Short mmCIF file of C-alpha atoms and ligand atoms in Angstrom, two decimals:
data_model
loop_
_atom_site.label_atom_id
_atom_site.label_comp_id
_atom_site.label_asym_id
_atom_site.label_seq_id
_atom_site.Cartn_x
_atom_site.Cartn_y
_atom_site.Cartn_z
CA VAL N 1 81.79 202.35 -36.72
CA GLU N 2 85.47 201.84 -35.74
CA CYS N 3 86.43 199.29 -38.40
CA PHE N 4 86.62 199.41 -42.21
CA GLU N 5 85.13 196.75 -44.51
CA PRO N 6 84.80 196.57 -48.37
CA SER N 7 81.01 197.16 -48.42
CA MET N 8 81.68 200.77 -47.38
CA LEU N 9 83.00 201.59 -50.88
CA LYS N 10 79.65 201.05 -52.72
CA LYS N 11 77.96 204.15 -54.17
CA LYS N 12 75.42 205.83 -51.81
CA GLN N 13 77.35 204.99 -48.62
CA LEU N 14 78.78 207.69 -46.37
CA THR N 15 80.60 206.17 -43.43
CA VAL N 16 82.07 207.90 -40.40
CA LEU N 17 84.97 205.90 -39.03
CA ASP N 18 85.35 206.87 -35.39
CA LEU N 19 89.05 206.39 -34.89
CA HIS N 20 90.17 207.74 -31.51
CA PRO N 21 93.54 209.57 -31.33
CA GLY N 22 96.47 207.12 -31.67
CA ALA N 23 94.28 204.44 -33.32
CA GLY N 24 96.43 204.27 -36.51
CA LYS N 25 94.03 206.20 -38.73
CA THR N 26 96.86 207.05 -41.20
CA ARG N 27 99.28 204.12 -40.85
CA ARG N 28 96.77 201.26 -40.51
CA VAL N 29 93.23 201.94 -41.74
CA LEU N 30 93.98 204.20 -44.75
CA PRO N 31 96.26 201.80 -46.73
CA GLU N 32 93.58 199.09 -46.39
CA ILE N 33 90.93 201.47 -47.74
CA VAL N 34 93.25 202.61 -50.53
CA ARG N 35 94.37 199.12 -51.64
CA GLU N 36 90.71 198.02 -51.87
CA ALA N 37 89.92 201.19 -53.88
CA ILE N 38 92.84 200.52 -56.26
CA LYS N 39 92.01 196.83 -56.54
CA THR N 40 88.40 197.63 -57.53
CA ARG N 41 89.37 200.58 -59.82
CA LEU N 42 87.44 203.26 -57.97
CA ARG N 43 88.49 206.76 -58.88
CA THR N 44 89.44 208.04 -55.42
CA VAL N 45 90.51 211.23 -53.75
CA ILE N 46 92.11 211.29 -50.29
CA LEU N 47 91.77 214.55 -48.45
CA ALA N 48 94.27 215.60 -45.79
CA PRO N 49 93.71 218.52 -43.42
CA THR N 50 97.23 219.95 -43.81
CA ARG N 51 100.30 219.59 -46.01
CA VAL N 52 102.13 218.15 -42.97
CA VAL N 53 99.54 215.36 -42.63
CA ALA N 54 99.60 214.74 -46.42
CA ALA N 55 103.32 213.93 -46.19
CA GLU N 56 102.63 211.35 -43.44
CA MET N 57 100.08 209.75 -45.77
CA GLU N 58 102.52 209.58 -48.69
CA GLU N 59 104.81 207.63 -46.35
CA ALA N 60 102.04 205.22 -45.25
CA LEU N 61 101.09 204.61 -48.92
CA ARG N 62 104.64 204.17 -50.34
CA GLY N 63 104.46 201.93 -53.46
CA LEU N 64 100.77 202.47 -54.22
CA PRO N 65 99.83 204.45 -57.40
CA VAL N 66 98.86 207.69 -55.62
CA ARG N 67 99.24 211.15 -57.20
CA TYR N 68 99.96 213.94 -54.66
CA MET N 69 99.03 217.51 -55.69
CA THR N 70 98.59 221.16 -54.66
CA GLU N 71 97.63 207.11 -61.15
CA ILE N 72 93.94 206.62 -60.13
CA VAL N 73 94.11 207.85 -56.53
CA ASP N 74 94.68 211.57 -55.95
CA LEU N 75 95.76 213.09 -52.64
CA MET N 76 95.39 216.73 -51.70
CA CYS N 77 94.58 219.03 -48.81
CA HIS N 78 90.95 219.83 -47.93
CA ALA N 79 91.59 223.47 -49.04
CA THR N 80 93.14 222.45 -52.40
CA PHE N 81 90.10 220.27 -53.20
CA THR N 82 87.60 223.03 -52.45
CA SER N 83 89.70 225.66 -54.33
CA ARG N 84 89.87 223.32 -57.37
CA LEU N 85 86.08 222.96 -57.21
CA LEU N 86 85.83 226.76 -57.40
CA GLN N 87 88.38 227.15 -60.26
CA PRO N 88 87.76 226.45 -64.00
CA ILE N 89 89.83 223.22 -63.49
CA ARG N 90 87.70 220.17 -64.25
CA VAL N 91 87.78 218.16 -61.04
CA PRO N 92 87.17 214.42 -61.58
CA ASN N 93 83.81 213.03 -60.50
CA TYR N 94 85.44 210.75 -57.92
CA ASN N 95 83.70 207.47 -57.04
CA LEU N 96 85.22 207.59 -53.56
CA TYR N 97 86.07 210.44 -51.22
CA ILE N 98 88.26 209.78 -48.17
CA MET N 99 88.43 212.70 -45.78
CA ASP N 100 90.97 212.53 -42.96
CA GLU N 101 90.32 214.64 -39.82
CA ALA N 102 86.74 215.15 -40.97
CA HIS N 103 85.85 217.23 -37.89
CA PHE N 104 88.08 220.13 -39.13
CA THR N 105 86.05 223.39 -39.10
CA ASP N 106 88.06 225.37 -41.68
CA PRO N 107 85.50 226.81 -44.21
CA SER N 108 87.00 224.78 -47.06
CA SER N 109 86.72 221.60 -44.97
CA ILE N 110 83.07 222.29 -44.07
CA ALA N 111 82.28 223.08 -47.73
CA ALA N 112 84.09 219.91 -48.89
CA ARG N 113 81.93 217.82 -46.52
CA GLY N 114 78.80 219.44 -47.90
CA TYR N 115 79.82 218.82 -51.50
CA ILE N 116 80.84 215.23 -50.78
CA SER N 117 77.75 214.25 -48.78
CA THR N 118 75.59 215.77 -51.52
CA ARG N 119 77.36 213.67 -54.16
CA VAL N 120 76.78 210.57 -52.04
CA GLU N 121 73.09 211.52 -51.59
CA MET N 122 72.83 211.99 -55.39
CA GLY N 123 74.05 208.37 -55.80
CA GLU N 124 77.28 209.32 -57.58
CA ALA N 125 79.89 208.25 -55.00
CA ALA N 126 80.79 206.77 -51.64
CA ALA N 127 82.62 208.58 -48.86
CA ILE N 128 84.52 207.77 -45.70
CA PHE N 129 85.01 210.45 -43.06
CA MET N 130 87.70 209.61 -40.52
CA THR N 131 87.85 211.39 -37.17
CA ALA N 132 88.07 210.99 -33.43
CA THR N 133 85.14 213.37 -32.99
CA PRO N 134 82.40 212.95 -35.57
CA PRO N 135 80.53 216.17 -36.43
CA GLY N 136 77.36 216.18 -34.31
CA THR N 137 78.98 214.39 -31.32
CA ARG N 138 80.12 216.12 -28.12
CA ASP N 139 82.55 213.91 -26.16
CA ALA N 140 85.64 215.82 -25.08
CA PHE N 141 87.17 212.62 -23.58
CA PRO N 142 87.41 209.95 -26.28
CA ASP N 143 89.36 206.68 -25.97
CA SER N 144 93.16 206.56 -25.87
CA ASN N 145 95.91 203.91 -26.16
CA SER N 146 96.56 204.42 -22.40
CA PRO N 147 94.33 205.86 -19.63
CA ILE N 148 94.41 209.63 -19.14
CA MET N 149 93.98 211.40 -15.81
CA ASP N 150 91.62 214.32 -16.47
CA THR N 151 91.68 217.14 -13.90
CA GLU N 152 89.93 220.48 -14.14
CA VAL N 153 92.12 223.27 -12.64
CA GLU N 154 92.69 227.03 -12.81
CA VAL N 155 94.97 227.29 -15.88
CA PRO N 156 96.95 230.54 -16.13
CA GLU N 157 96.56 232.57 -19.32
CA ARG N 158 99.08 235.33 -18.44
CA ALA N 159 102.58 235.43 -16.90
CA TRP N 160 102.48 234.51 -13.19
CA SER N 161 104.78 234.77 -10.18
CA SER N 162 103.03 232.99 -7.32
CA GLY N 163 100.76 229.96 -7.36
CA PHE N 164 100.51 227.50 -10.21
CA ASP N 165 103.47 225.66 -8.72
CA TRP N 166 101.94 222.46 -10.12
CA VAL N 167 102.95 223.88 -13.54
CA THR N 168 106.67 224.28 -12.76
CA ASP N 169 107.00 221.36 -10.28
CA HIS N 170 106.33 218.87 -13.12
CA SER N 171 109.52 217.04 -14.21
CA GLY N 172 107.99 215.44 -17.34
CA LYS N 173 107.21 217.07 -20.70
CA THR N 174 104.17 219.33 -21.30
CA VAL N 175 102.21 220.48 -24.38
CA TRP N 176 100.35 223.76 -23.61
CA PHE N 177 97.55 224.99 -25.91
CA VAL N 178 97.02 228.80 -25.91
CA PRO N 179 94.65 230.98 -28.03
CA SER N 180 97.36 233.16 -29.79
CA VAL N 181 101.07 233.63 -30.40
CA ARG N 182 100.95 236.77 -28.18
CA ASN N 183 99.44 234.86 -25.27
CA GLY N 184 102.02 232.09 -25.89
CA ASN N 185 104.99 234.52 -25.87
CA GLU N 186 103.99 235.81 -22.44
CA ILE N 187 103.48 232.31 -21.04
CA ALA N 188 106.76 231.05 -22.63
CA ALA N 189 108.71 234.08 -21.33
CA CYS N 190 107.34 233.37 -17.87
CA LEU N 191 108.37 229.68 -18.15
CA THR N 192 111.83 230.47 -19.60
CA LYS N 193 112.49 232.86 -16.65
CA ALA N 194 111.49 230.05 -14.24
CA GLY N 195 114.36 227.88 -15.61
CA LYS N 196 112.38 225.75 -18.10
CA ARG N 197 113.21 224.91 -21.68
CA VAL N 198 110.43 226.07 -23.99
CA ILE N 199 109.83 225.79 -27.75
CA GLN N 200 106.87 227.69 -29.21
CA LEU N 201 104.85 226.32 -32.09
CA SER N 202 102.62 228.25 -34.43
CA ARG N 203 101.45 227.92 -38.07
CA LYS N 204 104.30 230.03 -39.46
CA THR N 205 107.15 228.62 -37.28
CA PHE N 206 106.04 224.92 -37.08
CA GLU N 207 108.09 223.22 -39.84
CA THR N 208 111.33 224.68 -38.39
CA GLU N 209 110.57 224.62 -34.62
CA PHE N 210 108.76 221.25 -34.43
CA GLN N 211 112.09 219.59 -35.38
CA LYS N 212 113.61 220.81 -32.09
CA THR N 213 111.14 218.74 -30.04
CA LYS N 214 112.61 215.53 -31.50
CA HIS N 215 116.14 216.04 -30.02
CA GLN N 216 116.35 218.98 -27.56
CA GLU N 217 115.74 218.63 -23.84
CA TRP N 218 112.51 220.63 -23.74
CA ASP N 219 110.20 220.98 -20.74
CA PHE N 220 107.29 222.75 -22.45
CA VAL N 221 105.84 223.26 -25.92
CA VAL N 222 103.66 226.41 -26.07
CA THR N 223 101.52 226.06 -29.15
CA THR N 224 98.46 227.39 -30.83
CA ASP N 225 95.76 225.10 -32.23
CA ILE N 226 98.07 224.19 -35.20
CA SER N 227 99.34 221.28 -33.06
CA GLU N 228 95.76 219.87 -32.89
CA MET N 229 96.57 217.84 -36.06
CA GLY N 230 99.78 216.47 -37.62
CA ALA N 231 101.85 216.74 -34.45
CA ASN N 232 103.00 213.85 -32.31
CA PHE N 233 104.96 214.60 -29.19
CA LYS N 234 106.63 212.38 -26.62
CA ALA N 235 104.86 214.09 -23.75
CA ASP N 236 103.15 213.06 -20.52
CA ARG N 237 101.08 216.21 -19.92
CA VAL N 238 98.78 218.60 -21.74
CA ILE N 239 97.71 221.93 -20.29
CA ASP N 240 94.66 223.29 -22.02
CA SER N 241 93.06 226.68 -21.45
CA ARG N 242 90.13 225.35 -23.48
CA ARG N 243 89.84 228.76 -25.11
CA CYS N 244 90.31 230.19 -28.57
CA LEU N 245 89.71 233.38 -30.52
CA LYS N 246 86.91 233.02 -33.04
CA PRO N 247 86.01 235.25 -35.99
CA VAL N 248 82.45 236.47 -35.63
CA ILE N 249 80.36 238.51 -37.99
CA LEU N 250 78.81 241.48 -36.13
CA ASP N 251 75.49 242.63 -37.60
CA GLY N 252 76.39 241.27 -41.09
CA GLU N 253 78.70 244.27 -41.38
CA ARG N 254 82.19 243.43 -40.04
CA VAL N 255 84.17 240.47 -38.68
CA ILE N 256 85.78 240.74 -35.23
CA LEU N 257 87.96 238.26 -33.37
CA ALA N 258 85.82 237.51 -30.32
CA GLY N 259 86.93 235.78 -27.11
CA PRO N 260 88.93 234.04 -26.00
CA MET N 261 85.86 231.82 -25.68
CA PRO N 262 85.34 228.11 -25.05
CA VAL N 263 86.61 225.63 -27.61
CA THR N 264 84.42 222.87 -29.00
CA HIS N 265 84.34 219.30 -27.71
CA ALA N 266 86.24 218.17 -30.81
CA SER N 267 89.03 220.70 -30.35
CA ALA N 268 89.31 219.72 -26.66
CA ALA N 269 89.45 216.01 -27.67
CA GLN N 270 92.21 216.66 -30.20
CA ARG N 271 94.27 218.67 -27.67
CA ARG N 272 93.89 215.99 -25.01
CA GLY N 273 94.66 213.54 -27.81
CA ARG N 274 98.31 214.62 -27.94
CA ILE N 275 98.84 212.42 -24.80
CA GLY N 276 97.71 208.95 -23.61
CA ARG N 277 99.24 207.59 -26.83
CA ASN N 278 101.86 205.18 -25.46
CA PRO N 279 100.81 201.88 -23.74
CA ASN N 280 104.33 201.60 -22.26
CA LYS N 281 104.00 205.07 -20.66
CA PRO N 282 100.81 205.23 -18.56
CA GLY N 283 99.99 208.12 -16.25
CA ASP N 284 99.62 210.95 -18.74
CA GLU N 285 97.43 213.80 -17.56
CA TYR N 286 95.26 216.42 -19.19
CA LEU N 287 94.74 219.55 -17.08
CA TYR N 288 91.98 221.79 -18.45
CA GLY N 289 90.71 225.24 -17.50
CA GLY N 290 86.99 225.30 -18.25
CA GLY N 291 84.12 223.69 -20.10
CA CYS N 292 83.55 223.22 -23.79
CA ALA N 293 80.74 224.85 -25.72
CA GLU N 294 78.71 223.27 -28.52
CA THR N 295 77.35 226.76 -29.28
CA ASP N 296 79.74 227.74 -32.07
CA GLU N 297 77.09 229.12 -34.53
CA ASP N 298 78.60 232.56 -34.04
CA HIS N 299 81.77 231.24 -35.73
CA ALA N 300 82.15 232.91 -39.17
CA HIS N 301 83.47 229.69 -40.74
CA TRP N 302 79.96 228.23 -41.07
CA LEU N 303 78.63 231.08 -43.19
CA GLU N 304 81.92 231.18 -45.07
CA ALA N 305 81.45 227.48 -45.90
CA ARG N 306 78.00 228.33 -47.40
CA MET N 307 79.49 231.16 -49.46
CA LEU N 308 81.96 228.66 -50.94
CA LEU N 309 79.41 225.90 -51.50
CA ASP N 310 76.93 228.21 -53.25
CA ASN N 311 79.64 228.85 -55.88
CA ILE N 312 80.52 225.20 -56.59
CA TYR N 313 78.65 223.56 -59.50
CA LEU N 314 77.16 220.04 -59.23
CA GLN N 315 74.32 219.76 -61.71
CA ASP N 316 72.48 222.60 -63.47
CA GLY N 317 70.43 224.41 -60.77
CA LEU N 318 71.41 222.20 -57.83
CA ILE N 319 72.90 223.79 -54.67
CA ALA N 320 74.84 221.44 -52.38
CA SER N 321 73.76 221.38 -48.77
CA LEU N 322 76.07 221.19 -45.78
CA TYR N 323 76.83 217.80 -44.24
CA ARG N 324 73.54 217.02 -42.30
CA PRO N 325 74.98 217.03 -38.73
CA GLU N 326 76.39 220.54 -39.46
CA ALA N 327 73.56 222.02 -41.57
CA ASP N 328 71.86 223.78 -38.62
CA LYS N 329 75.01 225.77 -37.84
CA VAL N 330 74.07 228.51 -40.31
CA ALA N 331 71.08 230.78 -40.91
CA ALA N 332 71.11 231.36 -44.69
CA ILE N 333 68.78 231.29 -47.73
CA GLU N 334 69.79 228.55 -50.21
CA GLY N 335 71.86 229.89 -53.04
CA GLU N 336 71.85 233.44 -51.63
CA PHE N 337 75.64 233.70 -52.04
CA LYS N 338 75.73 232.33 -55.61
CA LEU N 339 77.62 234.81 -57.76
CA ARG N 340 77.28 235.21 -61.54
CA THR N 341 80.28 234.15 -63.70
CA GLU N 342 82.47 237.31 -63.53
CA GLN N 343 81.89 238.22 -59.85
CA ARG N 344 82.53 234.58 -59.03
CA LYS N 345 85.95 234.65 -60.75
CA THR N 346 86.76 237.80 -58.73
CA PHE N 347 85.69 236.09 -55.48
CA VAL N 348 87.97 233.14 -56.27
CA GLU N 349 90.94 235.28 -57.21
CA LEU N 350 90.48 237.37 -53.99
CA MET N 351 90.75 234.25 -51.81
CA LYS N 352 93.42 232.50 -53.91
CA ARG N 353 95.87 235.19 -55.10
CA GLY N 354 94.55 237.90 -52.77
CA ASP N 355 94.56 235.61 -49.75
CA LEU N 356 91.58 237.43 -48.25
CA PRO N 357 89.22 235.69 -45.81
CA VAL N 358 86.16 234.19 -47.53
CA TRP N 359 83.76 236.76 -45.99
CA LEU N 360 85.85 239.75 -47.07
CA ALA N 361 86.37 238.37 -50.61
CA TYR N 362 82.64 237.87 -50.90
CA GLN N 363 81.92 241.53 -49.91
CA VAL N 364 84.38 242.93 -52.42
CA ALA N 365 83.33 240.61 -55.26
CA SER N 366 79.56 241.10 -54.73
CA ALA N 367 80.06 244.90 -54.94
CA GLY N 368 81.30 244.47 -58.58
CA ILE N 369 84.89 245.47 -57.68
CA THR N 370 87.59 243.89 -59.91
CA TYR N 371 90.50 241.97 -58.42
CA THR N 372 93.19 244.66 -58.92
CA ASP N 373 91.08 247.73 -57.91
CA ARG N 374 92.18 248.54 -54.38
CA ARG N 375 90.38 251.84 -53.78
CA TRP N 376 88.01 250.07 -51.36
CA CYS N 377 90.96 249.54 -49.02
CA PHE N 378 91.03 253.30 -48.22
CA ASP N 379 87.45 254.62 -48.40
CA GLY N 380 85.74 253.02 -45.42
CA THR N 381 84.20 254.77 -42.43
CA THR N 382 86.53 256.18 -39.78
CA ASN N 383 85.92 253.33 -37.36
CA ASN N 384 87.35 250.87 -40.01
CA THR N 385 90.77 252.51 -39.67
CA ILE N 386 93.46 249.86 -39.23
CA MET N 387 96.09 250.49 -36.55
CA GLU N 388 99.79 249.66 -36.39
CA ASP N 389 101.29 250.15 -32.89
CA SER N 390 98.00 251.81 -31.79
CA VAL N 391 98.25 254.51 -34.55
CA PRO N 392 96.66 254.62 -38.05
CA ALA N 393 98.46 252.27 -40.41
CA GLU N 394 99.53 253.91 -43.68
CA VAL N 395 100.46 252.59 -47.14
CA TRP N 396 102.06 254.02 -50.30
CA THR N 397 99.41 253.23 -53.02
CA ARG N 398 100.13 252.20 -56.63
CA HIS N 399 100.14 255.94 -57.57
CA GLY N 400 102.70 256.95 -54.89
CA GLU N 401 100.36 258.72 -52.43
CA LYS N 402 100.57 257.69 -48.77
CA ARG N 403 97.06 256.76 -47.55
CA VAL N 404 95.57 255.65 -44.25
CA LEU N 405 94.46 252.02 -44.25
CA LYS N 406 90.71 252.18 -43.84
CA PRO N 407 88.93 249.37 -45.72
CA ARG N 408 85.26 249.67 -46.74
CA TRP N 409 84.63 246.24 -45.11
CA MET N 410 86.51 245.49 -41.90
CA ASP N 411 87.68 241.89 -41.24
CA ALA N 412 89.91 241.62 -38.14
CA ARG N 413 91.69 238.62 -39.64
CA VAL N 414 93.61 240.92 -42.02
CA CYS N 415 95.41 242.73 -39.16
CA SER N 416 95.23 240.31 -36.20
CA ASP N 417 99.03 239.82 -36.07
CA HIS N 418 102.07 241.52 -37.61
CA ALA N 419 102.28 239.01 -40.50
CA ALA N 420 98.61 239.42 -41.43
CA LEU N 421 98.84 243.23 -41.27
CA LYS N 422 102.03 243.19 -43.38
CA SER N 423 100.30 241.03 -45.98
CA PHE N 424 97.17 243.22 -46.08
CA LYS N 425 99.29 246.41 -46.52
CA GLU N 426 100.94 244.71 -49.50
CA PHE N 427 97.48 243.92 -50.93
CA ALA N 428 96.32 247.53 -50.35
CA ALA N 429 99.42 248.76 -52.22
CA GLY N 430 98.67 246.49 -55.21
CA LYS N 431 101.76 244.29 -54.75
CA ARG N 432 99.70 241.07 -55.10
K1 LIG K 501 86.00 223.24 -61.02
K1 LIG K 502 74.84 217.50 -47.93
#
């Protein structure tokens, strides 16, 4: 459905509001849902994908009794909701759950959808999932406010000299999606040397660098998938490699960052969605480098979502299932990741304070290791040695001895970039 009506708020209803990019999902639909929830005294939670998007929502709901957190309407990020479900905090049994960008495949988002849909199925609440690409659908070219010219081309993924003149010959403004900051740096450097003005966006530099797009005379924005949500540009072109790095669990033993491999239809729709937004500016184009793949069962996030869900309580003995259209994404035995009370607290602390990936936290917690015991960071097999500048990374441990970083369980997400590695060295040293 692409239109909200009051009947959608009755218990037992789960509605997916297909709102194409630029439809006014935040500014138009949401306040109408919220005012009807407030009017009828439904205890409601609104779930935003990011803190950036949550701020936009606060603005669109100015004046309404809404309590933002990290009143009878609460607003929080998908991750905050799921984390609160895992903590001792007593989370209200909301009558209504509103999830924005409900296609988001972060483990906490997947788990939240499973918890919510289960509560609806149990007859305890209603839910509204808002997204341009409903889970279970595979249309990379949804509707837009203005027609988009879609052209498949050879998109460069490394610095280039010759060819790809269509890239530089463009006099408009382009948003370019790349799989990593590294890949972006090379592409930006190449573009800067060709005389173009480039601003690079990434999770850690967004808040500060996004501002520059609003006033500077930029030609290109080289960004990672963080611009898939909560980022509006005044652009007429999107270049999309249609690739990303995905964490994959190899032989239930380690997590690698595989790829770059094809993105999903929903990611491709969101990227394309950055353009075709302005009726008064037709002619926007989306230039893409390959096909999409629905086969993302190798993505670790699905299993990670199950690990989280198995540790969220609903009713004595009951284990929440994943949202039905996503349930087949994971091969797992129900409740197999349910941890007893103490190991569960360790798991939670490892993800929250420790900031470890869900899969890694689970391995450490299930082995009976306590939060602050970091010996496991140094006693793995030789092939788990972590490198810094292609040489073994080393850390001064809490007792002053310099040890080689060699964790018992290897998860590539802890050393994928300099910031991640720096953070994991701090963890190994007991500084967190
Ligand atoms: K809780
Ligand atoms: K479910």
